[PDB]
Design a protein around this ligand. Structure first.
Ligand SMILES: Cc1ccc(Oc2nc3cc(-c4ccc5c(ccn5C)c4)c(Cl)cc3[nH]2)cc1C(=O)NO
Ligand SMILES: Nc1ncnc2c1ncn2[C@@H]1O[C@H](COP(=O)(O)O)[C@@H](O)[C@H]1O
Lengths: 386, 300, 174
C-alpha cells in the first residue's frame, strides 16, 4: 500500500520549504517525475496563512516560464493540499557551487540571464519572490536555472508598500534587514545581485559570523572584489548592490548593461524643433510635494488629524497609531468616498501625512471618484494648515 | 463603407489614449483669470470644468472662452478689464451661456472612433472629453488632430480607397466662400470680434493684394495670457504675432490640384489644424481644416 | 470520477507494523507506508460516511485526535465525512478560513519612492506637454499638492485605467 496521489507514486523527501514538506513523485505508467509540496490544512489554519496560500495558488497557477518551476496541478483532499510541480534533477544551485566552486564568466552570465528573466517575469505579473538565493535556484539536467519556493513572496498593489523582513540575512536588502517599507522589486534585485556575486566568486559578498558585523556590512554596502573579476561586471554588481534603493539598478538598467547583453539569448525577454502646443508657454514653475508636512511632534499632529476628521463629520476606523481609514458620505449622490491616511517621518523634526485613494468594487456610480477624493482631502488640508 | 469609415468603427476611443498623460480640471468657482493662467502653465489648451455644487462635470473651458471675455468686456488699454479679473468660471459661464443652455456630454472610452468623429462634427466642437462611465472620472480630451495622426500611422500600411487620390477641387473639401480674414494692420480686438461672429478656427493675415503673409489663429490668442499683454488689444495682429517670428515658419498652404493624401501628409507632418488654399500668386481661395477632412473621411 | 476522491489516512507515532481497516475495505488490514514516524495511505473514497480503525503493533486503536464514534456495543471507531467542498480547492480554502464611527511607537520612515513626483519630471520640448513618464506603481493613488497660493489649492494624483495612466490636476478655491 504505497502512497499514491493522482497516479503519481510518492517517493523520498526532496526537502522542507517555507510552508509544508516537498516529496518527489513518479507516474505509475510513464515514470514522469514531479515535486509535490504538501500543505496540511490544519497547519495553514494554525499559522493564519490561508489567504497567502490561496493567492500563491491563484497567481502561480498561471505562470509559464522556462526558468520558474511550473505548477501543474493543485489537488485538495480533506486533510491536505497537494501542489504538483515540475521536477528538476540538478538540485540546488547552492550545492552546485559548493561542489564545483565558482563558475567562469560565460557560465555565470548564462545562469544569471536565466534567473533575471524569471525575476522579471514575476514583476511583470506583479509578484515579488523576496526569498531569492542559490538555495532556492534549482538546476535541471541541462543546467537551466529554475526559481522555486514562493512561500515568502507577496503581491504588488498600486500605491501599496510591503513591510515584512523576509529571507536569509545574507540575501536581504539593507532596507529589509532594517525593517523598512519597500516596493519589492528593488529587494529581488539586491538578492539577484548577491546571487550573481556567488556565481562569479564562489563565496558571498556579505557574510560574517558576527551578526552585527554582517548587518553593518550590508547597510554600508561594502564587499570585496576579487582581482579576477571583470571590471564590467563589477560595475554591474555595484549598481545592483546600491544601499540607496533609489540609486539601485532596475531590471531595465541591467538589460541595458553591456556585460549582461553579451551573448544574451532572445527567448529570455519578450521585447531640435519646439513642440507647437508648448509654444505659447515659452513665449512667456512650482515644485510639487507629497501630502502635508509638519515639524511639530508626532503625538500632537496625530491628535490634530483625529480632531479635524471629526470636525468634517467623517467616519474613521483606526488601524495603527499612525494609520487611519476614513469614509465620507457624499451629500449629493448618497454614495461613499473612501481614503486612507498614514503618518511618516522625513527627518528628526519633520513628519508627513499621506493621503491615498481607496478604490471601490461597487456598481457604476455618479460623480468622479478621482475628484471626490481631491475634495475630501482638501477639506482636511484646509483645517490642518489653519 | 470605405477603408477609413470601417477603420474608425472598429477601434475604441481608449486606443488613442496615451500610456501616461496629464489632465487638468478646474472647479467652476475658480477665478477665471487664474484658470486661463493655469492653462498656459500646464501647456493645455482646454480643460474640464467641475461643479462642486452639482457634483458633476459641466463643460470645457477653452481659448474661445478667453476670446469671448476679451471682446465682450475690453474697453481700452487705459482701463483694466474688471470682469476678466473679478469673474469666476461659473459666473461668466452663466452670463455667456445664459442665452443658450447646452449640456456637455462625454464620450465613453468603449465607444468607437466613428462615434467620436460623429460627435465632433454634430456638435461643431474641437474638444471631446472621454469619461469612464463606471468611475465617473474624466480620462482624456480627444481632438481632431489626435484622431488624424492616429489614422495616418495606421492606414498608410493598408490599401486606400479611390477617394484619397482625388484632388482637393474634385472632392470639394473645405470652405471656399466668405473666408473670414484680417489685414496685417488689423487690431487684435477686431480679429477677436471676427472669431466671435464667424466662429472660425483661424483668420488669414493678407496684404494689399489679398496674398496670405501669415495666419492669426485662436491658439495664437492665448499668447496674450502668456505674456500678460491681454490688457492692450489695440495693437495689430502683426505686432501680436512677433512673439513667434523668432523661429518663423512661412504660413502653410495647399493648392486645389493637390490630392487629399498629399494635403493630409502635410498637415500631420507640420502638426497644424488647417491649410490655406491659394492660387499661383498666394491669394486666398479657401481653407481646409482637420474637421473638414475628418467629415470627408467619415462619409462614404 | 466523482466517486473517486483522494482521502489521506495518517497515523502519527512509532511502529514496526501499522495497518488500516475500515468500512471501505471490509475491515481488511491495509499496510501503511512509514516515513520517519508518519504512516500513510491515500484512498479514493465515495462521498459519504466511512468508519475506520488502526492496527498498531498488535493493538487495535482509533486516532484520538480525529473524530470518533461509539456504538451501543462499546466499539470505538474513527469516523470521516467525505465532502465535495474538500476536493474543490477554493471551496476548501474558503471553509478553512473562519467601528468606523468616531469613538475618539514611532512613525514609519517615509519611503523615498514617494518623493519622485511625476509632475516635477521634465518632459522633452519636442513632445506633447500633456504626455508624462510612466509612474512607479507604488505612487499611484497618492495625493500630491502645491503650496496653497492666491487662496487657490492645487491637488494632483496619478491613477491607472487598464494599461494607461492619468495624472489629474484640480484647481480649487480655499
Ligand atoms: C510536520 C508535519 C506534520 C504533518 C503534516 O501533514 C501531512 N504529512 C503528510 C505526509 C504524507 C506522506 C507522503 C508520502 C509518504 C509518506 C510516507 C511515505 N511516503 C512515501 C507520507 C501525506 Cl500523503 C500527507 C501528509 N500530510 C505536515 C507537516 C509539515 O508541515 N511538514 O512536515
Ligand atoms: N478663416 C475662415 N473663414 C471661413 N471659414 C473657415 C475659416 N477657418 C475655418 N473655416 C471653416 O470652419 C469650419 C470648421 O473648421 P475649424 O473651425 O477649422 O474647425 C470648416 O468648414 C472650415 O472650412
Amino acid at each position: 500500500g504505497s502512497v499514491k496521489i493522482g497516479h503519481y507514486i510518492l517517493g523520498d523527501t526532496l526537502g522542507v520549504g517555507t510552508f509544508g514538506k516537498v516529496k518527489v513523485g513518479k507516474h505509475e505508467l510513464t515514470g514522469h517525475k514531479v515535486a509535490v509540496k504538501i500543505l496540511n490544512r490544519q497547519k495553514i489554519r494554525s499559522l493564519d496563512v490561508v489567504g497567502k496560500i490561496r493567492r500563491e495558488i491563484q497567481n502561480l497557477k498561471l505562470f509559464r516560464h522556462p526558468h520558474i518551476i511550473k505548477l501543474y496541478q493543485v489537488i485538495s483532499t480533506p486533510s491536505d493540499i497537494f501542489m504538483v510541480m515540475e521536477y528538476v534533477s540538478g538540485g540546488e544551485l547552492f550545492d552546485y557551487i559548493c561542489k564545483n566552486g565558482r563558475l567562469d564568466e560565460k557560465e555565470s552570465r548564462r545562469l544569471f540571464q536565466q534567473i533575471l528573466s524569471g525575476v522579471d517575469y514575476c514583476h511583470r505579473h506583479m509578484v515579488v519572490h523576496r526569498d531569492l538565493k542559490p538555495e532556492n535556484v534549482l538546476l535541471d539536467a541541462h543546467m537551466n536555472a529554475k526559481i522555486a519556493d514562493f512561500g515568502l513572496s507577496n503581491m504588488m498593489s498600486d500605491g501599496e508598500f510591503l513591510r515584512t523582513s523576509c529571507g536569509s540575512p545574507n540575501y536581504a536588502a539593507p532596507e529589509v534587514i532594517s525593517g523598512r517599507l519597500y516596493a519589492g522589486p528593488e529587494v529581488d534585485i539586491w538578492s539577484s545581485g548577491v546571487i550573481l556575486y556567488a556565481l562569479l566568486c564562489g563565496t558571498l559578498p556579505f557574510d560574517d559570523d558576527h551578526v552585527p558585523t554582517l548587518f553593518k556590512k550590508i547597510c554600508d554596502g561594502i564587499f570585496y572584489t576579487p582581482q579576477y573579476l571583470n571590471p564590467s561586471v563589477i560595475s554591474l554588481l555595484k549598481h545592483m548592490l546600491q544601499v540607496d534603493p533609489m540609486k539601485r539598478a532596475t531590471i531595465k538598467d541591467i538589460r541595458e548593461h553591456e556585460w549582461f547583453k553579451q551573448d544574451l539569448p532572445k527567448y529570455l525577454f519578450p521585447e531640435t524643433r519646439p513642440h507647437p502646443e508648448r509654444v505659447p508657454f515659452l513665449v512667456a514653475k512650482a515644485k510639487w510635494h507629497l501630502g502635508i508636512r509638519s515639524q511639530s511632534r508626532p503625538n500632537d499632529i496625530m491628535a490634530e488629524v483625529c480632531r479635524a476628521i471629526k470636525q468634517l463629520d467623517y467616519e474613521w476606523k483606526v488601524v495603527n497609531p499612525y494609520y487611519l481609514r476614513v469614509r465620507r458620505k457624499n451629500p449629493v449622490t448618497s454614495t461613499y468616498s473612501k481614503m486612507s491616511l498614514q503618518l511618516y517621518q522625513v527627518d528628526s523634526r519633520t513628519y508627513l501625512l499621506d493621503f491615498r485613494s481607496i478604490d471601490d468594487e461597487l456598481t457604476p456610480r455618479p460623480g468622479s471618484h478621482t475628484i471626490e477624493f481631491f475634495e475630501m482631502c482638501a477639506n482636511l488640508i484646509k483645517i490642518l494648515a489653519q | 463603407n470605405s477603408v477609413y469609415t470601417s477603420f474608425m468603427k472598429s477601434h475604441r476611443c481608449y486606443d488613442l489614449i496615451p500610456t501616461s498623460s496629464k489632465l487638468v480640471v478646474f472647479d467652476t468657482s475658480l477665478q477665471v483669470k487664474k484658470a486661463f493662467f493655469a492653462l498656459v502653465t500646464n501647456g493645455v489648451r482646454a480643460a474640464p470644468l467641475w461643479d462642486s455644487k452639482k457634483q458633476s462635470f459641466v463643460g470645457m473651458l477653452t481659448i474661445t472662452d478667453f476670446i469671448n471675455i476679451l471682446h465682450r468686456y475690453y474697453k481700452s488699454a487705459l482701463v483694466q478689464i474688471y470682469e476678466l479679473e473679478e469673474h469666476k468660471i461659473e459666473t461668466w459661464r452663466e452670463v455667456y451661456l445664459q442665452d443658450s443652455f447646452k449640456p456637455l456630454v462625454c464620450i465613453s472610452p468603449n465607444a468607437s472612433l466613428f462615434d467620436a468623429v460623429s460627435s465632433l462634427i454634430r456638435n461643431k466642437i474641437h474638444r471631446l472629453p472621454v469619461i469612464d462611465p463606471e468611475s465617473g472620472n474624466t480620462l482624456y480630451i480627444l481632438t481632431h488632430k489626435r484622431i488624424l495622426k492616429f489614422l495616418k500611422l495606421f492606414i498608410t500600411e493598408f490599401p486606400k480607397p479611390e477617394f484619397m487620390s482625388k484632388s482637393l477641387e474634385e472632392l470639394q473639401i473645405g470652405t471656399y466662400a466668405n473666408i473670414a480674414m484680417v489685414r496685417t494692420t488689423t487690431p487684435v480686438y477686431v480679429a477677436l470680434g471676427i472669431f466671435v461672429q464667424h466662429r472660425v478656427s483661424a483668420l488669414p493675415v493678407v496684404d494689399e493684394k489679398g496674398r496670405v503673409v501669415d495666419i492669426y489663429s485662436k491658439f495664437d490668442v492665448i499668447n496674450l495670457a502668456a505674456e500678460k499683454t491681454y490688457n492692450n488689444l489695440d495693437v495689430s495682429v502683426t505686432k501680436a504675432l512677433q512673439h513667434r517670428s523668432h523661429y518663423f515658419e512661412g504660413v502653410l498652404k495647399c493648392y486645389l490640384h493637390e490630392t487629399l493624401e498629399t494635403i493630409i501628409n502635410r498637415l500631420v507632418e507640420a502638426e497644424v489644424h488647417r491649410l490655406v488654399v491659394v492660387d499661383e500668386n498666394d491669394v486666398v481661395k479657401g481653407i481646409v481644416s482637420l474637421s473638414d477632412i475628418l467629415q470627408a473621411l467619415v462619409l462614404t | 470520477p466523482a466517486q473517486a476522491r483522494p482521502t489521506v489516512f495518517r497515523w502519527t507515532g512509532g511502529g514496526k507494523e501499522v495497518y488500516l481497516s475500515g468500512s471501505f475495505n471490509n475491515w481488511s488490514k491495509l499496510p501503511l507506508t512509514r516515513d520517519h514516524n508518519n504512516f500513510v495511505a491515500i484512498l479514493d473514497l465515495p462521498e459519504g460516511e466511512h468508519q475506520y480503525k488502526f492496527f498498531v503493533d498488535g493493538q487495535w486503536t482509533h486516532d484520538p485526535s480525529e473524530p470518533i464514534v461509539t456504538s451501543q456495543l462499546g466499539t470505538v471507531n474513527n469516523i470521516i465525512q467525505v465532502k465535495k467542498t474538500d476536493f474543490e480547492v477554493f471551496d476548501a480554502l474558503m471553509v478553512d478560513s473562519q467601528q468606523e464611527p468616531y469613538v475618539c511607537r514611532a512613525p514609519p520612515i517615509l519611503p523615498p519612492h514617494l518623493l519622485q513626483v511625476i509632475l516635477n519630471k521634465d518632459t522633452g520640448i519636442s513632445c506633447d506637454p500633456a504626455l508624462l513618464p510612466e509612474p512607479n506603481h507604488v505612487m499611484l493613488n497618492h495625493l500630491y499638492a502645491l503650496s496653497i497660493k492666491d487662496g487657490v489649492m492645487v491637488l494632483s494624483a496619478t491613477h491607472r485605467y487598464k494599461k494607461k495612466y492619468v495624472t489629474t490636476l484640480l484647481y480649487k478655491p480655499i
